[PDB]
């Protein structure tokens, strides 16, 4: 009804909150006729005005979008994830939960409830849709109707109170490889490496202790190991009492890289150490024998402007992340890195790969690029959060190409789709929401994966602008069954 | 889907086609907290691309919007009316019916099916939502869920194959007063005056013959008569054979006004005759004894640029319609009019009234105005102005929506059951054609010139629609 007129709820970040459907979206160009599957993605979209006018972008209720590809057509469906939070607040007609990860600010009537918004990532696994939020269990939804079934503990087997929003699909076993931090509640060092079978059964839950009380947003998975990047993005229960942001980045502490053998336990966990820095999303990780590589954008401080963290406000240059490879060797002695190498020389984030090569050696990556040299002619703030360029890098040659969306548009996280099951690596398509911030229309744009610089080959033209979201995923129709 | 790259499907007329919901719309200003009820309106929104790319605006599947007012909040729900046409075309994944009102261009698989889109008007009556399209029966929908129940013949009693999209609610009996043209199929002169009880039972269906086969889009109802305006917007099977537009306006033929006593039959119907002209929507009609008045915009030719008719291309000057009163006297001899007089000197359409005075003497009317002297900063006939006229004085006031926006049909809401005439609110969709957002604006009915007192901010632009109506919550089954 009356949302606050802070920048977080105005302009390009105005509330959307519409659930709905479009059958057979308008197409410009030609949807590749063989494509048959689902593209899911999610954005935060507070159902009601927040209890705090300072509410973080990442605190809004998860709105799940589905784009079903088939027969040269794409259909649109969008629904709220009906978390425990969402259900109870709808019955009340108002917001009951408080600030980001701060149960102290919750209403008395919802104390002890799962506070998750399921607003970070959505992925098909075991015939169902996993809607994920770091601080809460995994929420199960129907991949096609987007009905919510509820939080899962995987048949009572999973002990961890939380479930990450960045699982990886082992390309051999089909297992869902995930992890959890704060596994025994907020401010607990408890961790866990998790694998879920292709039928949804919990196969393993390996606990271990983290070096910090810190955010563990993403991780890497290789053929033999799980890779945990630890940066001092620290949590403070004291700060929640002072109604200050849960997370604060400490520039003085080192970063760690923990390698866990996937068939071992906490005793086999080796920690390597490197200099202070801020680590972003993992493009991919793989191991060559005992040599472990993980690729991710690295910056000197927080790179996400909408992520309200404790300390000095968002420093734009310090927040520039560059795709970087970290290399460690399990056969070595000590905790030293073998190598750190910058893979791409333009500020980037939201990396993606050909998922058929997840956890293995690879060369093709796609990413959103921040090109501050381009004009931006859209009123409504959001200049620092502007990802206006789509990039492709060939890691085997260092060659790259990119596409600028123009002075009115932003681009959301891309996603690769193979041309066929046995196509060469990176042969196929990249899709991404291209949002026009003047006309307020969103196109699901389809690029040739190997020629993104040529611009979209097809655009699914929505009569609505989809709010800036987070992560999404493609699933072939063969996975629905 | 690949829709045509024509103006009829581009820019401000791009397809929308989204069904969906918004709980508790964003409000700017204050929604009058006493209001509890529903605002329904509908727009054409072809589910799939047409079989012929010259497809008319009026041929698109009906998309029904609901704004449910309650305790200072407004919720949004929008659903397709699931006509027989819509259902079968969805099953086929494509358009099967052809050009506007042209069964010869239909696919063989939908021969004989009802071709209606239920895209013209939506109104609550007898606890249900009547979704109407001239060429087809009335479609029954649920007023709150917008689920479609199907076409009705009112328990098999109604003989007419068609049902108008401009019924009036008699303010005394509560009956739904309607009519039909082409009542025995396309090209048939058969007409019918229809009344339906407040519980949905057919109370009367009075047949008669029209002076020629023409569009009979709107009509008037007074205390004692039904009033039918006849203009030579003609159709012929020949034009359908030549793949030409169903309707063609003949500037050489006269217009008629047929007055039917509401408790009589075809023999009591009196026809009056006047000069050629194009008649628009009816603001209201009433009779003072045998003196019958009907108010409506009148123009030299077609006033709707989105209406493709046969002849010369759209002439905007000829299409300027001005609210005009026609008067006839049932006590007179012959077919002469008593007079015709212009009530408002600015091009206008989509007239509305305090419907508590429908069929009766009245003075307050609201309208959309085409103010061509104002700027427009976006890439035909633009209704950029909302007007209020006091017919007892000729005084008027208006509100310009600004250089980015247009306005859709308004609708009056009384401040309370005992409020005097025109005391209350006027609501209308105000559409921003640059940002592509629509607001449901609420004006003070007697001071529209002050601008909205409240705006329900939608995160989407509602496509140009047609007619809608307000219904107090008390008229719904609880
Ligand atoms: Mg009216
Ligand atoms: Mg004006
Ligand atoms: Mg308009």
- For ligand 2, the distance from its centroid to the CA atom of residue B449, given in whole angstroms, is 10
What single DSSP character describes residue B199? T
Closest CA to A391 of A321, A449, A434, A334: A449
- The Cα B257–Cα B335 span in angstroms is 9
Closest CA to A470 of A144, A163, A117: A117
Closest CA to B320 of B348, B282, B283, B281: B348
- The Cα A311–Cα A232 span in angstroms is 13
- The Cα A297–Cα A229 span in angstroms is 12
Closest CA to A385 of A350, A425, A341, A431: A350
- For ligand 1, the distance from its centroid to the CA atom of residue B266, given in whole angstroms, is 28
Phi, psi angle pair for A263, to nearest 5°: -110, 30
This structure's resolution (angstroms)?
Answer: 2.3
Total CB pairs under 8 A between chain A and B: 81
- Compute the half-sphere exposure of residue B94: CA atoms within 13 Å on the CB side of its CA: 9
R_g of chain A, CA atoms, integer Å: 21
| Joined tokens for residue A154 | 């995987």
What are the beta bridge partners of residue A228? A258
Q: Determination method here?
A: X-ray
What single DSSP character describes residue A301? S
- The Cα B345–Cα A285 span in angstroms is 74
What residues have CB less than 8 Å from A261, skipping those under 6 apart?
A224, A225, A268
Is residue A147 within 8 Å of A141, Cβ to Cβ?
A: yes
- The Cα B295–Cα B51 span in angstroms is 38
Phi, psi angle pair for B232, to nearest 5°: -80, 60
- The Cα A286–Cα A31 span in angstroms is 33
State the distance between the two ends of chain B, measured CA to CA, in whole angstroms. 41
| Joined tokens for residue B343 | 């009530």
What are the beta bridge partners of residue B29? B454
- Does B17 contact chain A (CB < 8 Å)? yes
CB pair distance less than 8 Å for A22 and B18: yes
Instruction: Convert A148-187 to b/e letters by CB count within 10 Å (16 or more is b).
Output: beebbebeeebebbbbbbbbbbbeeeebbbbbbbbbbebe
String of DSSP letters for B399-452: EE--TTEEE---EEEESSTTPPTT-EEEEEEEEETTTTEEEEEEEETT-GGG--
What residues have CB less than 8 Å from A116, skipping those under 6 apart?
A83, A84, A85, A133, A135, A136, A137, A139, A151
- For ligand 1, the distance from its centroid to the CA atom of residue B343, given in whole angstroms, is 17
String of DSSP letters for A308-364: --BSS---TTTT--EEEEEEEETTSSSS--SEEEE--SS-EEEEEE-GGGTTS---E
- Compute the half-sphere exposure of residue B130: CA atoms within 13 Å on the CB side of its CA: 33
Residues of chain B found within 8 Å of residue A438, distances taken between Cβ atoms: 434-435
Closest CA to A470 of A101, A68, A166: A166
State the distance between the two ends of chain A, measured CA to CA, in whole angstroms. 41
- The Cα A320–Cα A318 span in angstroms is 6
What are the beta bridge partners of residue B152? B138
Give Cα separations from A270 to A336, B70, B148, B388 (angstroms).
Answer: 11, 61, 64, 79
Break chain A down into helix, strand, coil percent, rounded to 5. 10, 40, 50
Closest CA to B178 of B143, B144, B214, B133: B133
Instruction: Convert A394-406 to b/e letters by CB count within 10 Å (16 or more is b).
Output: ebeeeebebbbbe
Is residue A84 within a helix (H) or strand (E), and if so which, with residue range? helix A84-92
- Does A463 contact chain B (CB < 8 Å)? yes
Q: Which residue of A has its CA nearest to B17?
A: A22
Question: Can you give B73-96 as a three-state secondary structure string?
Answer: EEEEEEEECCCHHHHHHHHHCCCC
Is residue A293 within a helix (H) or strand (E), and if so which, with residue range? strand A291-299
- The Cα B364–Cα B346 span in angstroms is 17
CB pair distance less than 8 Å for A17 and B2: no
Residues of chain B found within 8 Å of residue A31, distances taken between Cβ atoms: none
- The minimum CA-CA distance between B122 and chain A, rounded to whole Å, is 21
Closest CA to A365 of A328, A390, A338, A340: A390
B 90-129 near A (Cβ less than 8 A): 90, 93
Give Cα separations from A340 to A219, A257, A275, A351, B167 (angstroms).
Answer: 17, 12, 11, 18, 76
- The Cα A330–Cα A292 span in angstroms is 8
Phi, psi angle pair for B356, to nearest 5°: -65, -15
| Joined tokens for residue B256 | 């008629």
- Does B187 contact chain A (CB < 8 Å)? no
Q: Which residue of A has its CA nearest to B20?
A: A20
CB pair distance less than 8 Å for A20 and B78: yes
- The minimum CA-CA distance between A191 and chain B, rounded to whole Å, is 38
Dihedral sign of CA atoms B327, B328, B332, B335 in order: positive
- The Cα A278–Cα A297 span in angstroms is 8
- Does B24 contact chain A (CB < 8 Å)? yes
Dihedral sign of CA atoms B263, B265, B268, B272 in order: positive
String of DSSP letters for B364-401: EEEEEE--TTS----------EEEEEETTT--EEEEE-
- The Cα A169–Cα A475 span in angstroms is 11
Burial label, B220 (beta-carbon count in 10 A; 0-12, 13-18, 19+): buried
Is residue B433 within 8 Å of B420, Cβ to Cβ?
A: no
Angle in degrees, CA B406, B409, B413, rounded to 5 = 125
Closest CA to B60 of B122, B15, B28, B124: B15
- The Cα A271–Cα A256 span in angstroms is 6
R_g of chain B, CA atoms, integer Å: 21
Q: Which residue of A has its CA nearest to B432?
A: A439
- The Cα B223–Cα B221 span in angstroms is 7
What residues have CB less than 8 Å from A158, skipping those under 6 apart?
A137, A152, A194, A202, A205
CB pair distance less than 8 Å for B26 and A440: no
| Joined tokens for residue A369 | 């690029």
Burial label, A233 (beta-carbon count in 10 A; 0-12, 13-18, 19+): buried
What residues have CB less than 8 Å from A45, skipping those under 6 apart?
A15, A16, A17, A60, A61, A62, A63, A80, A119, A467
- The Cα B138–Cα B144 span in angstroms is 18
Angle in degrees, CA A74, A78, A81, rounded to 5 = 140
Is residue B200 within 8 Å of B128, Cβ to Cβ?
A: yes
- The Cα B321–Cα A206 span in angstroms is 78
Closest CA to B231 of B324, B366, B104, B369: B324
Phi, psi angle pair for A436, to nearest 5°: -95, 115
Give Cα separations from B27 to A13, A164, B32, B473 (angstroms).
Answer: 16, 36, 11, 21
| Joined tokens for residue A172 | 């051999």
CB pair distance less than 8 Å for A20 and B90: no
What residues have CB less than 8 Å from A98, skipping those under 6 apart?
A51, A52, A104, A105, A106, A107
- Compute the half-sphere exposure of residue A149: CA atoms within 13 Å on the CB side of its CA: 17
Residues of chain B found within 8 Å of residue A78, distances taken between Cβ atoms: 20
Burial label, A248 (beta-carbon count in 10 A; 0-12, 13-18, 19+): middle
Task: Please report the beta strands in B6-115, taking only residues with DSSP state E, as ranges in sequence order.
Answer: 19-22, 26-29, 36-44, 62-70, 73-80
Which residue ranges make up each domain of chain B?
A: 1-478
Is residue A87 within a helix (H) or strand (E), and if so which, with residue range? helix A84-92
């Amino acid at each position: 009804a009356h949302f606050p007129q802070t920048p977080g709820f105005s302009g390009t970040l105005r509330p959307l909150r519409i659930e709905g459907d479009i059958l057979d979206i308008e197409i410009e160009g030609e949807v590749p006729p063989q494509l048959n599957g689902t593209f899911h993605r999610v954005h935060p979209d507070a159902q009601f005005p927040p209890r705090f006018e300072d509410d973080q972008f990442f605190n809004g209720d998860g709105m799940v979008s589905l784009f079903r590809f088939h027969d040269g057509k794409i259909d649109f469906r969008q629904r709220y994830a009906q978390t425990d939070k969402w259900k109870v607040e709808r019955k009340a007609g108002k917001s009951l939960f408080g600030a980001y990860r701060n149960p102290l600010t919750d209403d008395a009537s919802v104390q002890g409830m799962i506070r998750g918004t399921a607003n970070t990532n959505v992925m098909v696994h075991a015939g169902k849709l996993y809607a994920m939020k770091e601080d809460s269990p995994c929420l199960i939804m129907d991949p096609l109707t987007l009905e919510t079934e509820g939080y899962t503990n995987f048949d009572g087997k999973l002990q961890s109170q939380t479930f990450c929003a960045h699982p990886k699909i082992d390309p051999v076993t089909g297992n869902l490889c995930a992890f959890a931090y704060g596994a025994k509640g907020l401010m607990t060092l408890d961790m866990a490496y998790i694998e879920i079978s292709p039928t949804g059964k919990l196969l393993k839950e390996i606990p271990f202790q983290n070096p910090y009380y810190c955010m563990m947003h993403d991780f890497g998975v290789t053929e033999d190991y799980a890779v945990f990047a630890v940066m001092p993005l620290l949590s403070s229960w004291d700060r929640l009492e002072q109604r200050l942001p849960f997370f604060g980045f400490d520039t003085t502490l080192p970063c760690y890289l923990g390698i866990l053998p996937r068939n071992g336990d906490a005793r086999d966990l080796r920690w390597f150490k490197t200099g202070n820095c801020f680590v972003g999303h993992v493009m991919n990780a793989f191991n060559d024998g005992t040599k472990v590589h993980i690729d991710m954008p690295v910056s000197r401080n927080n790179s996400f402007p909408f992520f309200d963290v404790h300390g000095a406000p968002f420093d734009p240059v310090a927040g520039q992340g560059f795709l970087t490879r970290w290399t460690v060797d399990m056969a070595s002695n000590g905790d030293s890195f073998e190598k750190t190498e910058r893979l791409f020389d333009r500020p980037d984030e939201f990396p993606r790969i050909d998922e058929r090569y997840a956890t293995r050696a690879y060369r093709h990556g796609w990413m959103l690029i921040l090109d501050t040299e381009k004009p931006y002619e859209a009123p409504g703030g959001a200049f620092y959060a502007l990802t206006n360029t789509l990039g492709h890098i060939d890691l085997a040659t260092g060659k790259s190409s990119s596409w600028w969306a123009g002075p009115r548009c932003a681009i959301q996280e891309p996603c690769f789709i193979p041309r066929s099951p046995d196509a060469p690596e990176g042969d196929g398509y990249v899709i991404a929401l291209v949002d026009d911030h003047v006309a307020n229309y969103s196109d699901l744009a389809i690029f040739d994966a190997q020629h993104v610089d040529q611009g979209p080959i097809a655009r699914a033209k929505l009569p609505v602008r989809i709010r800036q979201g987070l992560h999404g995923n493609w699933a072939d129709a063969s996975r629905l069954a």
